[PDB]
Amino acid sequence: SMEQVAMELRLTELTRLLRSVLDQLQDKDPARIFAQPVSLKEVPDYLDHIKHPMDFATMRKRLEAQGYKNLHEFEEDFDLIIDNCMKYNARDTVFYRAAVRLRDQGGVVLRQARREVDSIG
Ligand code: NA
């Protein structure tokens, strides 16, 4: 149906916007602390601590399968990246501090992305 097609064109345009949002968010992580999943080989206890791991590569895989239906879903995953890190790592660490910075800087990007997703529909 043409209705189905038009919904698919909306999903695709959301996907394009979310890709640019994701690149912008990831530039706020020049150290690449959040680039890849935490390794269970190097933090073998990780999953006793953190129930839903997230990272930018996993977000990117989901994005390219057009797996985000809206901005809310994408933001939930970005938030898990931050929130996971701030629980596992202590306040005095380079990891926790990189999370705080990503959060603060990412908040600006997401503020306007929310207006672009509303605005362009
Ligand atoms: Na903690």
Q: How far is the CA of 115 from the centre of ligand 1 (A)?
A: 33
Q: Which residue reads 């949002």 in tokens?
A: 21
What's the residue count for the chain? 121
| 3-class SS letters over 19-37 | HHHHHHHHHCCCCCCCCCC
Q: How far is the CA of 3 from the centre of ligand 1 (A)?
A: 48
Q: How far is the CA of 26 from the centre of ligand 1 (A)?
A: 23
Q: Domain 1-121: give its CATH superfamily.
A: Bromodomain-like (1.20.920.10)
Resolution in A: 2.0
What CA–CA distances, in Å, run from 101 to 1, 4, 52?
A: 46, 40, 21
Which residues, 6 or more positions from 41, have their beta carbon under 8 angstroms from its beta carbon? none
3-state class (DSSP) for residue 118: helix
| Tokens at 71, concatenated | 């901005």
The answer to whether the CB of 63 falls within 8 A of the CB of 82 is: no
Q: How far is the CA of 89 from the centre of ligand 1 (A)?
A: 5
Q: How far is the CA of 41 from the centre of ligand 1 (A)?
A: 21
CA distance between the termini of the chain: 21
Which residues, 6 or more positions from 67, have their beta carbon under 8 angstroms from its beta carbon? none
C-alpha torsion sign, points 5, 77, 24, 46 = negative
Q: How far is the CA of 96 from the centre of ligand 1 (A)?
A: 9
Q: How far is the CA of 75 from the centre of ligand 1 (A)?
A: 22
C-alpha torsion sign, points 105, 97, 74, 32 = positive
CA angle 83, 85, 65 (to 5 degrees): 70
